[PDB]
Amino acid sequence: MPTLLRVYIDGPHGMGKTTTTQLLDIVYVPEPMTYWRVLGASETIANIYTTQHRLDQGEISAGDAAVVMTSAQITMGMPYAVTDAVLAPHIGGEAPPALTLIFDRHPIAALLCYPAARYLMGSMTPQAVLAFVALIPPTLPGTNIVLGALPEDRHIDRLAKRQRPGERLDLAMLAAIRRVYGLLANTVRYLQCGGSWREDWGQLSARPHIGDTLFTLFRAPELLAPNGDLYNVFAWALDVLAKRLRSMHVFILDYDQSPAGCRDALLQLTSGMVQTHVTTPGSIPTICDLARTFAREMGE
Amino acid sequence: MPTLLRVYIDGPHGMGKTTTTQLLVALDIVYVPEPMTYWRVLGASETIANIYTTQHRLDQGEISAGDAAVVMTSAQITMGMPYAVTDAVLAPHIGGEAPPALTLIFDRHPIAALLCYPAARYLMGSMTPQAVLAFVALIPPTLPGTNIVLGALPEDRHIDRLAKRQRPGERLDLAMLAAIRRVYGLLANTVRYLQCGGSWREDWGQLAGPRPHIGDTLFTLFRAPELLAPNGDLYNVFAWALDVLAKRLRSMHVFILDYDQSPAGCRDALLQLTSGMVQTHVTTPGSIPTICDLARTFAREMGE
Ligand SMILES: O=c1[nH]c(=O)n([C@@H]2CO[C@H](CO)[C@@H](O)C2)cc1I
Ligand SMILES: O=c1[nH]c(=O)n([C@@H]2CO[C@H](CO)[C@@H](O)C2)cc1I
């Protein structure tokens, strides 16, 4: 059957990601803004940033924050999750392509990166983070993930110029999310170089050091037993983390250039990306409508 | 290679489910229990208590539906966590459909936390139908050999027994008993509907044994005004969530166990049903031992 190329442009918010994808037999699955502001719940982006503000202000407790942040992250990841579930059966083994699917973010942004960042923010429990991790859908073949690079001071500049409605400029949240995605990129390399977190776990007390991968975040006292040992349930959540990330193809896009440049840069990276066959000839058209319908309904 | 038999004993609470499985294992069979220690300690503090108090508060009007929902949605994540990792860690060892060299008796299936309780809580006014669908979209792929046993018990018998099966922190909420009973009845119907070639998209306009009316399956719950577009049609996102619902439930093997008997009887009844259950091969003959430790470690750490 025809081949399909899927590209998930992910990374921290405030880099120009949505723009450069606009700038690119190619369909675009944008940011689920209408689902975040209306369909799933009322103004979720606003709810998220206010809560952190309240928490930071001490007007609420960490536990209230957590209960709100955990509930909000469910809403934020819903469109990403169904799309993947409805898409999964059409994806065949790894294989110009007959269809290029450009996505605005992968499911891991809602199910992993933002939760870890919010945990780093004091607004989410590490146990919840692992619950979302356990819920990460099996990584299909041809999962090419593009993460962005941008010097911090420059990022503060782009971050400022484009806050979604309800957003607040939280530089603390900018540092946590940037940290989380940096670790995510390291975790993939670590894993692909044969890294075994169980073996390198003690080091927390070619290939990155386990202390430079996401695994270092789960060395939290809530997840450890009176003797330091990670509880098995959590250890298993890490086995899933390892599993999900290892088959992902990560590509780095430098956002410290102009929109036409980022667009150009994104097109070059496209060559080393993994393609796949679809499961039926009629998967291409179906995938198309899916994307085109997702956009029409949830795009804003 | 060796074969494996998986049996998930599910259904409403207060029926004696956990008991009969203990009894069954007391008879190459490992038991994966309700993860109470994870609910009361490891994942969070006294989650069962949190759940029932919230409903109480809500019912009392001491809090709003929106607060309730934020708490129920968060609590249900904690409740389903052990179920979810267990399935993800188990999934690669499961081979195609095939005396089992190992029988894995589970205490509920991931759908109890990811589907049934949420729908029930939605029915209770403590959860949004949008949240319910988010959990439904997170339901892990249904492995081959997923035999689910659901229980039957007349309402009055259940009512009295419920009162006799209060978990620490639970309250006798008969409204929640009716909602959950309703949700699981629908679940059983949905599976038959699906196996009889039912298409919710076709029967949408309408909202063993023959096929049920879509109005008697879970699909009827999602005919909620929150999920309805200006034109009266379901939003696509939610329609897709129902495609996943249909997909996940259609490959499940549902068996009904009558709990209106004695514990030794339920145990005996459970053993007969075991014959028509689907077995599967493991992916590595050494999957058998691994699965064993998994279950034996899950129990030792989360059982309580
Ligand atoms: O799970 C998520 N959680 C969030 O808080 N966001 C944020 C939503 O608002 C903006 C969308 O980029 C960013 O500020 C990220 C995104 C996701 I995807
Ligand atoms: O998702 C769930 N949510 C729940 O509220 N429960 C309830 C928890 O308390 C008892 C044991 O699980 C029953 O009252 C069910 C179980 C599950 I599994």
Structural domains in chain B plus CATH codes:
1-304 (3.40.50.300)
According to DSSP H, which parts of B91-217 are helical? 110-111, 117-123, 129-137, 155-162, 174-195, 200-203
Asked whether the CA dihedral A91, A93, A96, A102 is positive or negative, the reply is positive
Question: Which residues of B does the annotation mark as catalytic?
Answer: 34
Q: Which of B118, B109, B101, B92 lies closest to B146, judged by CA?
A: B109
Question: Which ligand is the nearest neighbour of the Cα of B135?
Answer: 2
Tell me which residue in B42, B70, B241 faces A67 most closely, judged by beta carbons: B70
Q: Which atom of ligand 2 is nearest to the CA of B167?
A: 10
Cβ–Cβ < 8 Å for B47, B39? yes
Residues present in chain B in total: 304
- Whether A240 sits inside 8 A of B73 (CB atoms) is no
Gaps in chain A with C–N over 2.5 Å, residue before each: 24, 95, 205
For tokens 């044969």, name the residue: A194
Maximal CA-CA distance, chain A:
57
Q: CB of B242 within 8 A of CB of A82?
A: no
Check A31, A152, A167, A199 and give the catalytic one. A31
Q: Give every CB contact of residue A175 below 8 A, 6+ residues apart in sequence.
A: A152
Closest CA to A31 of A167, A137, A173: A167
Atom of ligand 1 nearest to the CA of A113: 1
Q: How far is B67 from chain A (nearest CA, A)?
A: 9
Q: How far is CA B26 from the centre of its chain?
A: 24
- Give me the residue from A131, A135, A231 closest to B301, CB to CB: A231
Size of interface A-B (CB pairs under 8 A): 119
Of B117, B122, B135, nearest to B58 (Cα)?
A: B122
Question: Quick one: B199 exposed, middle or buried, by C-beta within 10 A (0-12, 13-18, 19+)?
Answer: exposed
CA of B158 to the centre of ligand 2 (A): 16
Identity of the residue in A74, A82, A85 whose CB atom sits nearest the CB atom of B131: A74
**Nominal resolution (angstroms):** 2.4
Inter-residue contact A183 to A213 (CB < 8 Å): yes
Q: Is the CB of B213 under 6 A from ligand 2?
A: no
The H-or-E segment that residue A146 falls in is: strand A144-149
- Which residue puts its alpha carbon closest to atom 9 of ligand 2? B48
Elucidated via: X-ray
A121 annotated to bind ligand? no
- Please indicate whether, in this complex, the C-beta atoms of A41 and B128 are within 8 angstroms of each other: yes
Contact B238, B227 (CB under 8 A): yes
For atom 13 of ligand 1, which residue has the closest CA? A13
Nearest CA in chain B to A293: B236
DSSP string, B217-271: SGGGGG--TTSB-TTSPBPHHHHHHHHHHHHHHTT-EEEEEE-SS-HHHHHHHHH
Is A13 known as a binding-site position?
yes
C-alpha B157 to ligand 2 mean position (Å): 19
Pairing of strands B279-282, B94-97: antiparallel
Length of chain A: 300
Nearest CA to A285 out of A25, A105, A7 is that of A25
Residue nearest ligand 1's atom 7 by CA: A45
Secondary structure class of B10 (helix, strand, coil): strand
Give the C-alpha separation, A75 to A164, whole Å: 16
Tally of helices (H runs) and strands (E runs) in chain A: 13, 7
Residue A213: C-alpha distances to residues A158, A207, B72, B172 (Å): 26, 10, 32, 47
Helices (H) and strands (E) in chain B, counts: 13, 7
Q: Is B167 annotated as a binding residue?
A: yes
Residue B118, both tokens: 């949420």
* Ligand 2 close to Cβ of residue B48 (< 6 A): yes
Helix (H) or strand (E) holding A78: helix A62-87
Q: Is B13 annotated as a binding residue?
A: yes
d(CA B298, CA B204): 41
Whole-number Cα distances in Å, B219 to A81, B136, B183, B214, B244? 20, 12, 11, 7, 12
